[PDB]
């Protein structure tokens, strides 16, 4: 399938790059999925004084079924890249929400590497309350600024990112754990450590 709008004004696609630090103004690489809930525009914002990619969204009333169908899931595809050394992905990941009381956001990764079935998924799934966010201090220009690491010894199924397994593309998914969640959302420095 393919959730589809009219065309939206992203930032220029530019180059998949990692560490994704997103400061030559374009995307490098970075898209949404064509099964994506939300397909409004990627736009390059400053975030706690640097350059990041970020949306809106604010996640429906009443939830789908399946637990992706309304999140954001935005993909590096073709980077064709491997973890190495690296024990972790990380990435600083912000939010300015404009409502945000209940619930919470659950902050998926996965890859596709083509010598296991094109998906492997960290099992490292992230939960950010909703509720502790009033008690959180703020960046300088009023974000919420997490840096979320996955221990990349941890994938399901039992499968293996080896230091050469070649990771065709990284996903992203901020799925809606039953939240009220409205506001902008940001990514920057995307990379292994
Ligand atoms: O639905 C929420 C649920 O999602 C689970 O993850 C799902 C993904 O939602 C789904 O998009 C993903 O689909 C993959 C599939 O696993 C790959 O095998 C397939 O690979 C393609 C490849 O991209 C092509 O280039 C190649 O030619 O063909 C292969 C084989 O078809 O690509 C699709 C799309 O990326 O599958 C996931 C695992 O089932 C989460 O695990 C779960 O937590 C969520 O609740
Ligand atoms: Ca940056």
Same mark, same amino acid.
């Given at each position: 399938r393919a959730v589809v709008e009219a065309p939206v004004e992203h930032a220029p696609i530019g180059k998949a =790059? #990692? !560490?994704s630090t997103f400061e030559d103004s374009t995307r490098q690489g970075w898209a949404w999925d064509a099964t994506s809930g939300v397909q409004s %525009? #990627? =736009?390059?914002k400053d975030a706690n004084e640097s350059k990041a990619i970020s949306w809106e969204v604010k996640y429906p009333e009443v939830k789908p079924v399946d637990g992706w169908?309304? %999140? !954001?899931?935005?993909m590096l595809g073709n980077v064709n890249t491997t973890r190495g050394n690296n024990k972790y992905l990380t990435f600083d990941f912000y939010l300015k929400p404009t409502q945000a009381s209940k619930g919470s956001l659950t902050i998926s990764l996965a890859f596709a590497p083509p010598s296991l079935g094109f998906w492997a998924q960290a099992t490292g799934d992230v939960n950010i309350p909703l509720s502790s966010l009033s008690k959180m201090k703020k960046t300088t220009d009023g974000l919420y600024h997490f840096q979320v690491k996955y221990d990349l010894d941890k994938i399901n199924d039992g499968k293996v990112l080896t230091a050469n397994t070649v990771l065709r593309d990284i996903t992203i998914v901020v799925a809606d754990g039953n939240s009220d969640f409205a506001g902008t959302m940001y990514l920057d420095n995307i990379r292994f450590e």
């Open positions: =790059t #990692l !560490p %525009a #990627l =736009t390059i169908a309304s %999140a !954001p899931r935005i």
